[model samples]
Target: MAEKVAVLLGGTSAEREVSLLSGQAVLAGLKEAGIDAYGVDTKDFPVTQLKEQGFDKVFIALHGRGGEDGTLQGVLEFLQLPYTGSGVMASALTMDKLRTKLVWQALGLPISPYVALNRQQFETLSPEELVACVAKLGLPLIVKPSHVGMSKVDHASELQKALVEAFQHDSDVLIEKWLSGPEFTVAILGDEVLPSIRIQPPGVFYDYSDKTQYFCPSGLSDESEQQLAALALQAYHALDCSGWGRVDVMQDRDGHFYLLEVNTSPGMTSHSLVPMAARQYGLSFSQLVARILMLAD
Candidate 1:
C-alpha cells in the first residue's frame, strides 16, 4: 500500500486563502497518484486531532505566517511526524527577511546594502542628520516592515510617512536602496534546482501585491536560464536548505545578482509559484509532491 499522506493547508496568515487552494490541489494530486491522502487545515493543528487521523507523512502547503514561519514545522518535529520541508531553524531564518539577508551577506552572497531603523529614530532624527545618513546610500530606498512579508506593503513617498507605514507592520523596518533588476524565484527540490522563473510585474517595485498582480514567467534566453540555474544552486547550498524552498533574487542591469530572501515552505497549491516552477521543469504535480515525500525525515 502507498504511504498515507496528510496535506496541511490554510492557516492564520494573510495568505491563508492561497494556501487552502494549494492544499486542495496537492491533496487531489497525491490521491490521483495512488497515495492515501487527507486534507488537514490549520484547525487540525495542535497534533492531537492529527495524530488521531494517523497519517504516515505530511505535505505542508501553508504559506505566510504561522505555516511557513517554522511554527508548523516545529510542531510536526515535536510530534515526531515526519513532514516535507526544512527543519525549524531554516524555516525560521527564511521566514524573516532581515535575518536571511544577514546570513546571506555573512556568507559573502551578493546582496544590496540595507539599514534597519526604528520609527522613533526616523521621527526624531534631524533633516541634515537624516540626509547625511541616507546620502551615503542614495534615494529610491525600499522600506518595509522588518519581520513581516510585503503582501500589502503600504509605502509612502515622503520619508516620514513611509516610516509611519513601516511601523504599522513592526516596531522596526529595514530600508534598503532599491536595486533595479530582473527579479527571479528559484525553487529547489531536494538536491535538484527546478526551473528558475523571472518575475516581471507592472509596478514601480516588487511587493506582495505586485507578485500576484501582473507577474509572468521570464522567457529568458537559454544562456540566461543556465546562468540563473547555476547561481540558484549555489544559493540553495549556502543557506543549508534541505528538501524544498524558494529563493527570491534579482539581477541588476549592471549584471550583478542579489539574493533577496528564501521561503522554506513555499506554497504548494496549483497556482503557487514553486509548484509553477516545478511543473515548468517537467515535474508533474504528483511527481513533485512524491519527490518531496521521499525526502521527508
Candidate 2:
C-alpha cells in the first residue's frame, strides 16, 4: 500500500487551477505520511505511462469535468490502477447533477424540485411554452448548467438571461426551486462522516470564492447533526461513492435538508472543506490524505 504513488492533478478542466492547488497539497501530505509519491498533471504527462513510470496507485486530486467526469476514472480502471474516490459509473453519475438528483429522488432521499431545459427545447419552442415550463417552481429560482453551474434568480423576468448564461456552460440547463437558506457541507472519509460545516458566504451561495466562512460545529444540535450525517451517508452510498467525497446540502423554509450535489473529487487544500471537516474529526491533513490513499490501495 505504501509503494510509489502518483498524485494525479491539473487537467484541462475549468478546475485545473484548484486541482493543482489540491494536488500539490495532496502530494505534500503523502510525503508527510512517509509514502513515496509524486505529482503528475494530465496535461503535462500521459497517464498511459504511469505503470512504466513506476506508480503503483493513483491519488486523484483533479476536480471538474475532464478529471472527475469518469473519463479519467475509466482510464485508471483500464490501467488497473487503484485510485482514490468514486469509480467509473459513480464518477460520471455524480458529476451529472440531473442524474445525481434523480438517483436520490428514486431512493426517496430529499432533493429540491427542478426543471430541465435542453438547447433543443430552447431553440424549438416559443417563449410562452418556456415560461410555462417553470410555472410550478415559482420565483426565486436557481438556474444552472445542467450538470451544475450556479446562478440565483429572484424575479421571474430574469429567467431568460440566466438561462442564456447557463447555456454558456452547457447546452442543457437545470432550473431548481431555490432552497433558500443555510447551506451545510458534509465530508465522507471511508465509512465515517466528518463533522458538518455551515457556510456563510458573502454571496448568495458558496461560489468557491475566498469570501465564504465555515463553522465546523455548524451550530447544529446533536440530533440535527446525526440526522445530517446519516442522510449524507445514505446519499453517498446510493451513488456507490467510496474513498472520500463531499455532499453539499441546502435547506428550505421549513428547514428540510435537500441534496445539492456530490463532489467525487473534493478539494484538499489546507483551507478546503474536507480538510477543515477532517480536523474536527480528529485527523490531521496528512493523516486525512494518507487514509484516503490507503483506502485506494
TM-score each candidate: 0.88, 0.93
Clashing pairs for predicted structure model 2, backbone only: none
List, residue by residue over 1-297, the lDDT tens digit for candidate 2: 448889998988888888889999999988998999999999989978888898889999998877887988898999898999999999999978788888999999999889888998888887577778888997788888866456888776777777887887788778889877799999999999999999888877677466678897899889889999999999999999998999999878997899988889998888889999999989999999889987885
Query: Candidate 1: worst 10 consecutive residues by lDDT?
Result: 148-157
TM-score of 2: 0.93
| Candidate 2 segments whose C-alpha is farther than 4 A from its true place | 148-150
Best model per TM-score = 2
lDDT of 1 by residue, 178-267 (tens): 777778888888888877777767766565552443243566777877777777777777767788888888887687778888778777
Our tally of clashes for model 1 stands at: 1
Candidate 1 regions with alpha-carbon error over 4 angstroms: 119-124, 148-157, 209-217
